[PDB]
Amino acid sequence: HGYVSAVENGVAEGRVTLCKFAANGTGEKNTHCGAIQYEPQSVEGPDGFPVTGPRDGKIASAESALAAALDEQTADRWVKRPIQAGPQTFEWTFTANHVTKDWKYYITKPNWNPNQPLSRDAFDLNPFCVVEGNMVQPPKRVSHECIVPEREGYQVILAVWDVGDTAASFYNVIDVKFDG
Ligand SMILES: [Ca+2]
Ligand SMILES: [Cu+2]
DSSP states (O other): OEEEEOSSSOSSOOTTHHHHSOOTTTOOOOOOOGGGGGOGGGOEEESOTTTSSSOTTOTTTTTOGGGGGGGOOOTTSSOOEEOOSEEEEEEEEESSOOOEEEEEEEEBOTTOOTTSOOOGGGBOSSOSEEEEEEEEOOOSEEEEEEEEOOOOEEEEEEEEEEETTSSEEEEEEEEEEEOO
16 A cells, blocks of 8 residues: 655655645645545555556546546646656655565656546556566655656656555556646
């Protein structure tokens, strides 16, 4: 159990994280998140996106009944966090730092449609960042240095934490705003 955070080093909090914790700097929160707002660490879903795992339209919730509210997708629905292309650091905070297979990060395609539910077709399925977990426990907070591709405007990053000793992964979408 854990979530994408910006407590020590991260560039942008997960969408679910902002249902509970105020955004760095602005204090913005996401609203009307349903029950997941009390446990942003619990967006747990089946392994194997995009081959298996959460189906289209259920990616942001990872098919969790707790997090169903996160599957809404419009241009204005969610708090967007500023980002730039190039080197950036993403951060996970774990309430339970399970043995880890890897972390993978995907970004939406340049001309994705922010006004329809998220789907495999919205994302570049070639992950822009992969971090090996080596089937060991990570520390309770980790920072991953990634190269973020060039984009304009509103984009979504999908961060996947694959727990190595269960058939489950944690799925945190991130709402980011590039210049332009
Ligand atoms: Ca797993
Ligand atoms: Cu857990």
